[PDB]
Amino acid sequence: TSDMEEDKDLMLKLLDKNGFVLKKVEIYRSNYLAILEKRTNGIRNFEINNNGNMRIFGYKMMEHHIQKFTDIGMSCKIAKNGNVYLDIKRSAENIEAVITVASEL
DNA sequence: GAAAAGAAGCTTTGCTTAATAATCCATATGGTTATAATGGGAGCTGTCACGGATGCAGG
Protein backbone atom coordinates (compact mmCIF):
# COMPACT_ATOMS: atom_id res chain seq x y z
CA THR A 1 0.00 0.00 0.00
CA SER A 2 0.97 3.64 -0.43
CA ASP A 3 0.32 4.19 3.29
CA MET A 4 3.06 1.61 3.81
CA GLU A 5 5.16 3.71 1.41
CA GLU A 6 4.61 6.94 3.35
CA ASP A 7 5.12 5.15 6.64
CA LYS A 8 8.35 3.84 5.14
CA ASP A 9 9.21 7.48 4.34
CA LEU A 10 8.71 8.68 7.92
CA MET A 11 10.29 5.44 9.20
CA LEU A 12 13.54 6.03 7.30
CA LYS A 13 13.19 9.71 8.21
CA LEU A 14 13.17 9.02 11.95
CA LEU A 15 15.68 6.16 11.92
CA ASP A 16 18.00 8.19 9.68
CA LYS A 17 17.22 11.11 12.01
CA ASN A 18 18.00 9.40 15.32
CA GLY A 19 21.37 8.01 14.19
CA PHE A 20 20.22 4.37 14.07
CA VAL A 21 22.01 3.07 11.00
CA LEU A 22 20.57 0.23 8.95
CA LYS A 23 21.98 -3.03 7.67
CA LYS A 24 19.62 -3.19 4.68
CA VAL A 25 16.09 -2.06 3.84
CA GLU A 26 14.28 -4.86 2.04
CA ILE A 27 10.93 -5.52 0.40
CA TYR A 28 10.54 -9.16 1.45
CA ARG A 29 7.26 -11.09 1.18
CA SER A 30 6.20 -7.62 -0.05
CA ASN A 31 7.01 -6.35 3.45
CA TYR A 32 9.48 -3.73 4.64
CA LEU A 33 12.52 -4.48 6.79
CA ALA A 34 14.21 -1.63 8.65
CA ILE A 35 16.94 -4.01 9.76
CA LEU A 36 19.36 -2.74 12.39
CA GLU A 37 23.08 -2.84 11.61
CA LYS A 38 24.12 -4.84 14.66
CA ARG A 39 22.02 -6.71 17.19
CA THR A 40 21.65 -3.61 19.34
CA ASN A 41 19.63 -3.93 22.58
CA GLY A 42 18.94 -7.51 21.51
CA ILE A 43 16.96 -6.20 18.52
CA ARG A 44 17.28 -7.39 14.92
CA ASN A 45 14.95 -5.40 12.68
CA PHE A 46 12.25 -2.72 12.61
CA GLU A 47 9.91 -4.27 10.07
CA ILE A 48 6.61 -3.32 8.47
CA ASN A 49 4.02 -5.88 7.50
CA ASN A 50 1.39 -4.91 4.95
CA ASN A 51 -1.34 -6.05 7.35
CA GLY A 52 -1.52 -2.66 9.10
CA ASN A 53 1.06 -3.68 11.71
CA MET A 54 4.60 -2.37 12.00
CA ARG A 55 6.65 -4.81 14.04
CA ILE A 56 9.87 -4.73 16.07
CA PHE A 57 11.61 -8.09 16.22
CA GLY A 58 14.73 -9.03 18.13
CA TYR A 59 16.96 -11.67 19.67
CA LYS A 60 17.44 -11.74 23.46
CA MET A 61 16.05 -8.31 24.20
CA MET A 62 16.09 -7.27 27.83
CA GLU A 63 12.86 -7.15 29.81
CA HIS A 64 13.03 -3.42 30.52
CA HIS A 65 13.18 -2.61 26.80
CA ILE A 66 10.02 -4.72 26.37
CA GLN A 67 8.46 -2.74 29.21
CA LYS A 68 9.46 0.49 27.46
CA PHE A 69 7.67 -0.63 24.31
CA THR A 70 4.62 -1.82 26.23
CA ASP A 71 4.55 1.74 27.57
CA ILE A 72 3.47 2.75 24.05
CA GLY A 73 1.27 -0.34 23.88
CA MET A 74 2.96 -2.99 21.75
CA SER A 75 2.37 -6.72 21.68
CA CYS A 76 5.20 -9.19 22.15
CA LYS A 77 5.89 -12.80 21.25
CA ILE A 78 8.92 -14.38 22.89
CA ALA A 79 10.32 -17.53 21.35
CA LYS A 80 12.13 -20.53 22.78
CA ASN A 81 15.51 -19.06 21.75
CA GLY A 82 15.04 -15.37 22.61
CA ASN A 83 13.30 -14.13 19.47
CA VAL A 84 10.86 -11.39 20.44
CA TYR A 85 8.01 -9.92 18.37
CA LEU A 86 6.59 -6.45 19.05
CA ASP A 87 3.35 -5.57 17.29
CA ILE A 88 2.04 -2.06 16.80
CA LYS A 89 -0.34 -0.57 14.25
CA ARG A 90 1.37 1.05 11.26
CA SER A 91 0.76 4.78 11.72
CA ALA A 92 2.87 7.94 11.72
CA GLU A 93 2.25 8.55 15.43
CA ASN A 94 3.33 4.97 16.08
CA ILE A 95 6.40 5.65 13.93
CA GLU A 96 7.25 8.61 16.14
CA ALA A 97 6.44 6.68 19.32
CA VAL A 98 8.32 3.48 18.46
CA ILE A 99 11.36 5.35 17.19
CA THR A 100 11.30 7.67 20.21
CA VAL A 101 11.22 4.72 22.62
CA ALA A 102 13.90 2.95 20.57
CA SER A 103 15.80 6.26 20.64
CA GLU A 104 15.90 6.17 24.47
CA LEU A 105 16.73 2.50 25.09
C1' DG B 1 -32.48 -25.63 -15.37
C1' DA B 2 -30.53 -22.02 -12.29
C1' DA B 3 -27.15 -20.79 -8.32
C1' DA B 4 -24.95 -20.95 -3.74
C1' DA B 5 -21.54 -23.66 -1.86
C1' DG B 6 -17.94 -26.41 -0.77
C1' DA B 7 -13.80 -29.08 -2.22
C1' DA B 8 -9.19 -29.71 -5.49
C1' DG B 9 -5.56 -27.62 -6.40
C1' DC B 10 -2.37 -23.98 -6.88
C1' DT B 11 -0.09 -20.09 -4.36
C1' DT B 12 1.87 -17.20 -0.13
C1' DT B 13 3.74 -16.32 4.73
C1' DG B 14 4.62 -15.66 9.35
C1' DC B 15 6.92 -18.54 12.10
C1' DT B 16 10.49 -21.99 13.28
C1' DT B 17 14.59 -24.27 13.35
C1' DA B 18 18.69 -26.43 12.04
C1' DA B 19 23.16 -25.24 10.10
C1' DT B 20 26.91 -22.42 10.86
C1' DA B 21 29.88 -18.12 11.87
C1' DA B 22 31.87 -16.04 16.10
C1' DT B 23 33.81 -15.80 20.62
C1' DC B 24 35.22 -16.92 24.95
C1' DC B 25 36.57 -19.59 28.27
C1' DA B 26 37.75 -23.87 30.76
C1' DT B 27 41.79 -26.50 30.66
C1' DA B 28 46.29 -28.16 30.26
C1' DT B 29 50.87 -27.51 30.67
C1' DG B 30 54.77 -25.81 31.99
C1' DG B 31 57.50 -22.82 34.44
C1' DT B 32 58.95 -20.89 38.55
C1' DT B 33 59.41 -19.37 42.58
C1' DA B 34 66.51 -19.49 45.34
C1' DT B 35 67.95 -17.49 53.61
C1' DA B 36 66.52 -21.77 56.17
C1' DA B 37 63.07 -25.50 57.07
C1' DT B 38 66.54 -33.11 57.89
C1' DG B 39 62.76 -40.14 60.73
C1' DG B 40 54.74 -41.32 61.50
C1' DG B 41 50.91 -42.69 63.70
C1' DA B 42 47.04 -45.36 65.06
C1' DG B 43 48.37 -49.16 66.78
C1' DC B 44 43.48 -52.30 70.78
C1' DT B 45 44.25 -53.57 74.65
C1' DG B 46 37.46 -57.49 77.44
C1' DT B 47 37.30 -63.86 72.93
C1' DC B 48 37.94 -68.23 71.77
C1' DA B 49 38.46 -73.02 70.86
C1' DC B 50 40.89 -75.75 68.06
C1' DG B 51 44.78 -76.78 65.20
C1' DG B 52 48.62 -77.33 62.48
C1' DA B 53 52.95 -75.41 61.42
C1' DT B 54 56.93 -73.88 63.00
C1' DG B 55 60.35 -73.86 66.52
C1' DC B 56 63.62 -75.26 69.78
C1' DA B 57 66.12 -78.94 72.36
C1' DG B 58 68.44 -82.90 74.12
C1' DG B 59 69.66 -87.99 73.51
The A22-27 sheet, strands edge to edge: A22-27, A32-40, A43-48, A53-59, A83-89, A75-78
Contacts of A97 (CB under 8 A, 6+ apart): A72, A88
The distance (Å) linking the CA of A103 with the C1' of B51 is 99
Considering only CA atoms, which of A65, A78, A74 is closest in space to residue A97?
A74
Q: Which nucleotides of B are covered by protein (CB under 7 A)?
A: 12-18
Q: Is A42 helix (H, G, I), strand (E, B) or coil?
A: coil
Phi, psi of A80 (to 5 degrees): -80, -5
Complete domains list, chain A, with CATH: 1-105 (3.90.1150.20)
Which 8-state DSSP code applies to residue A50?
Answer: S
A84 dihedral zone (left: phi>0; alpha: psi -120 to 50; beta): beta
**Which experiment gave this structure?**
cryo-EM
The distance (Å) linking the CA of A50 with the C1' of B41 is 86
